[PDB]
Design a protein around this ligand. Structure first.
Ligand SMILES: O=S(=O)(Nc1ccc(Sc2nc3cc(Cl)ccc3s2)c(Cl)c1)c1ccc(C(F)(F)F)cc1Cl
Ligand SMILES: O=S(=O)(Nc1ccc(Sc2nc3cc(Cl)ccc3s2)c(Cl)c1)c1ccc(C(F)(F)F)cc1Cl
Ligand SMILES: O=S(=O)(Nc1ccc(Sc2nc3cc(Cl)ccc3s2)c(Cl)c1)c1ccc(C(F)(F)F)cc1Cl
Lengths: 258, 262
């Protein structure tokens, strides 16, 4: 059945490339040292932030940035989702349910690709905001990304590439344990096919990294935690920033995440 | 090597049997009614609680002196007994005692909760849980009928158990699974993660070979099981959220010293 699980991985890797413009391979090239052609502008203080304003207050504008991009992220993830075999064939309501709870877990997973212990790529790689600058922002804004860094650091630790992430992302989506799913069996039969394909994929692409499959699935707790904490932070600004205004798409996702 | 993995499983199984008298197989015999042994006193409401208190041994796990509070205390006591059993089982996991003394303390401090509810699932069915070595059976509704916040404590655990038992795992599977949980190299404060994750790998291969041979008809049981580790961490986190609600809205100092964790 290998031929089937390998062909499946092959298909997901393909859709993943067609759905996500900024892959890990590209982010790493910019973060390592291809440079010259891909060299990023860095923001580490209010000074450079201003000089880099060519690519409300500061914290609010940076936040406004994230939301717009997440919205964009949701769009891509939705597109990738309809490519996972069996997904569009499931009950419409559950498709929506899988997306509402899968989106943030996937966003921070892929966001790890653009991070390193020191910062994160922004504006499609055009820029790079240091971890410290972000942390100096007035709270609760300065407390938004730190947990993501902690996660990204431990997660990138696995040294996964895009083809692995392709399947892993698929697995996060087809989670039968989401709140409200009407039909759980059908969703789980798909995941069993994905988890299977992931394990094989991880054993073939990383023949030296022992129990990578088991180590990867264990990162789910970190994702869930980061997501919950995020949802909390959103509440604070929801009360302290009554003129914030959230995108409707994000408003629907945050509906019951608290 | 396959012979080593098969050996480690048997070893952990024998060790598990020694550390835990009330096995899952035996627990299921009592539940399904398929046993010649005395049926457990059922606690379905207050009246029966005060009733079967004698044979239920609720006087031995409770101070000299209301219900909700008293059942909660019973839980703590059984939990502490569990910790010791888990702690002795740890010693039997190859390499465990050879680790830094601090990491052992750490692995156990953060591991016991996950393992308690995992094992507790072996004494539960959709309607309730076996108690006191099987001499009792407290129903799910009675616990849920308890006043707030106490009635919110066990419900989450039932939802988990019902899904967990669907995996139809046996004591031989559970043994390796438990060990896997204890040897988690991602616990806060570990000083030397290398040897710890090295042991988990061994336990993970042993667990996977064990699942494949004992559950051939079950695809990805291994993966599915690993996912349950996520459900457990969730259950422990919520648990703490409820506990804090207690410490805030609540005694004997010396007694609290025994139950200063669980
Ligand atoms: O909780 S956040 O970490 N969310 C958040 C949301 C979207 C993006 S952008 C972003 N870019 C990509 C690119 C790819 Cl290829 C995949 C996923 C993403 S997510 C970023 Cl960098 C952060 C966050 C950090 C800092 C702030 C602020 F600076 F405003 F305080 C707000 C948020 Cl929401
Ligand atoms: O994709 S983003 O590059 N969008 C984004 C959105 C607004 C501003 S701030 C900004 N403020 C001004 C003010 C003037 Cl008068 C002119 C130009 C600009 S650009 C910045 Cl620096 C970035 C981005 C940056 C940083 C993060 C995060 F902080 F989360 F890491 C996320 C994103 Cl999406
Ligand atoms: O998080 S818990 O699910 N852990 C937990 C820990 C040990 C046992 S065993 C247990 N054995 C006995 C025996 C007697 Cl005679 C009386 C009460 C109990 S509770 C059980 Cl059933 C649950 C829990 C459930 C319910 C309550 C309370 F009823 F107080 F609300 C508290 C906890 Cl901690």
């Amino acid at each position: 059945e290998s031929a089937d699980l390998r062909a499946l991985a092959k298909h997901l890797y393909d859709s993943y490339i067609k759905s996500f413009p900024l892959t890990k391979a590209k982010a790493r090239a910019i973060l390592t040292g291809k440079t010259t052609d891909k060299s990023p502008f860095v923001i580490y203080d209010m000074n450079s932030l201003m000089m880099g304003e060519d690519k409300k207050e500061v914290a609010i504008r940076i936040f406004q940035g994230c939301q717009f991009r997440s919205v964009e992220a949701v769009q891509e993830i939705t597109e990738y989702a309809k490519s996972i075999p069996g997904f569009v064939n499931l009950d419409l309501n559950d498709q929506v349910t899988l997306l509402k709870y899968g989106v943030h877990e996937i966003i921070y997973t892929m966001l790890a690709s653009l991070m390193n212990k020191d910062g994160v790529l922004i504006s499609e790689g055009q820029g790079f905001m240091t971890r410290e600058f972000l942390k100096s922002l007035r709270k609760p804004f300065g407390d938004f990304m730190e947990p993501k860094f902690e996660f990204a650091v431990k997660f990138n630790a696995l040294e996964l590439d895009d083809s692995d992430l392709a399947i892993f992302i698929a697995v996060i989506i087809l989670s039968g344990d989401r709140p409200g799913l009407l039909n759980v069996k059908p969703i789980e039969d798909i995941q069993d096919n994905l988890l299977q394909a992931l394990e094989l994929q991880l054993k073939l692409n990383h023949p030296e990294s022992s129990q990578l499959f088991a180590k990867l699935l264990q990162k789910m707790t970190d994702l869930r935690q980061i997501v919950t904490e995020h949802v909390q932070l959103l509440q604070v600004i929801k009360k302290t920033e009554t003129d914030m205004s959230l995108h409707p798409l994000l408003q629907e996702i945050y509906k019951d995440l608290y």
